[PDB]
Every structure is written in C-alpha cells, then in structure tokens.
mmCIF file with all atom_site columns, C-alpha atoms in Angstrom:
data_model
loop_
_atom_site.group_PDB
_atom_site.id
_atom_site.type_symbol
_atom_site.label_atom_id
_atom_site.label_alt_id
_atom_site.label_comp_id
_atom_site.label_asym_id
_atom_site.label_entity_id
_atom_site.label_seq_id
_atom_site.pdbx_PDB_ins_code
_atom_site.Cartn_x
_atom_site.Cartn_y
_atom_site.Cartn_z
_atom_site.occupancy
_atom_site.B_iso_or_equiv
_atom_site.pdbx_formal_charge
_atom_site.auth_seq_id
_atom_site.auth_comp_id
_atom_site.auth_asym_id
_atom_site.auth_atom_id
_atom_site.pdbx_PDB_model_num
ATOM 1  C CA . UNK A 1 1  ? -14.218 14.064 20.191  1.00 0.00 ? 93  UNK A CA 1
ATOM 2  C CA . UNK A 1 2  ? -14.735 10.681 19.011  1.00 0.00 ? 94  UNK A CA 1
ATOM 3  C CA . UNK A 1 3  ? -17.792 8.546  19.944  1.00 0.00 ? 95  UNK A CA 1
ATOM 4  C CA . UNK A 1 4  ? -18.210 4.894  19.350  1.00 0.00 ? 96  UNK A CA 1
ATOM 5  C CA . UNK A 1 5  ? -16.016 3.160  17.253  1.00 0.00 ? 97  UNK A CA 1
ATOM 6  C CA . UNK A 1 6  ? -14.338 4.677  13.849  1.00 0.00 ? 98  UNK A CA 1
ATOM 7  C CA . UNK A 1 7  ? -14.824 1.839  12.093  1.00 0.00 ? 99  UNK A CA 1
ATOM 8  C CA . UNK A 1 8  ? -11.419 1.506  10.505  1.00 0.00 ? 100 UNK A CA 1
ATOM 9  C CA . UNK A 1 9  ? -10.808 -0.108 7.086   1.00 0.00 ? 101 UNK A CA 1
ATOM 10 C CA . UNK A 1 10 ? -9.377  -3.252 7.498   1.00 0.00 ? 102 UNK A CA 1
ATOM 11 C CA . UNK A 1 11 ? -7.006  -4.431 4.532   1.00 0.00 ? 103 UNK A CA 1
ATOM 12 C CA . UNK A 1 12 ? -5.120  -2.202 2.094   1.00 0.00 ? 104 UNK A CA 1
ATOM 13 C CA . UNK A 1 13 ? -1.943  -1.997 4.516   1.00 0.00 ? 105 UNK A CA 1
ATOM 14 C CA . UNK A 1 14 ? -0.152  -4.865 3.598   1.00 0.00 ? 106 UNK A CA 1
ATOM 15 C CA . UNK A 1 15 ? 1.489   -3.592 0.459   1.00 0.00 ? 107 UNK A CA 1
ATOM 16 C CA . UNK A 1 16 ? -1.766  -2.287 -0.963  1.00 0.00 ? 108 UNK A CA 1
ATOM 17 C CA . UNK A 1 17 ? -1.692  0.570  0.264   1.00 0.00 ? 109 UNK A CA 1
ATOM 18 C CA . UNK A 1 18 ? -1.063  2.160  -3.356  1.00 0.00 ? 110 UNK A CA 1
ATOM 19 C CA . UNK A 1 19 ? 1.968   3.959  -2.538  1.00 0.00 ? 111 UNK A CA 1
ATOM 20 C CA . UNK A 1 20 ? 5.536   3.404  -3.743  1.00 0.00 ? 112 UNK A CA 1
ATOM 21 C CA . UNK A 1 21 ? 4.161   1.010  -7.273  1.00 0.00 ? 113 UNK A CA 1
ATOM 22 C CA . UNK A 1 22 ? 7.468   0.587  -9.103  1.00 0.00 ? 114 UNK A CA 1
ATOM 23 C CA . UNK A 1 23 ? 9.087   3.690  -7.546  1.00 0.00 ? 115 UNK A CA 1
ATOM 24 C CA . UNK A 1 24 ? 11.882  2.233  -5.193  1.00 0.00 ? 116 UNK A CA 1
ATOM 25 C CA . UNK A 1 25 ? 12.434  -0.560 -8.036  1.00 0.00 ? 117 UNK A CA 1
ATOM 26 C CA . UNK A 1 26 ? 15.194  -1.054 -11.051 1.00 0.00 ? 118 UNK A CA 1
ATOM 27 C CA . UNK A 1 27 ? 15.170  -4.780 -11.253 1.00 0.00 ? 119 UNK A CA 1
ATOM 28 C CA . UNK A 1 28 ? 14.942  -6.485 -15.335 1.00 0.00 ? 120 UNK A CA 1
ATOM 29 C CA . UNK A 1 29 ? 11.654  -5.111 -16.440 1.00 0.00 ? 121 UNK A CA 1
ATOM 30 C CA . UNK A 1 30 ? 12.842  -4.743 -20.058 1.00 0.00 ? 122 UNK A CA 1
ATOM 31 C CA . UNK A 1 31 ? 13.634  -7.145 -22.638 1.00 0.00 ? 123 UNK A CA 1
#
C-alpha cells in the first residue's frame, strides 16, 4: 502493498452506513 495514504471515506459510519434500515425494528409504524 500500500503506498501513500488510502484516502478513506470519512462519514457514512455513524448509522449511515445503509445496513440494518428497519430490519432489527417492530416499534408502532402502523396506524
């Protein structure tokens, strides 16, 4: 291998990372 700096993608951990929307969830979305 790896030369200088990967860069890496700040953001889009906290939460936002896309996975687990509404999966782990059962709370009063219905009326």
């Amino acid at each position: 291998x790896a030369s200088i700096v990967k860069t890496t993608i700040k953001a889009x951990k906290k939460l936002c990372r896309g996975f687990x929307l509404x999966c782990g969830c059962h709370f009063t979305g219905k009326k």
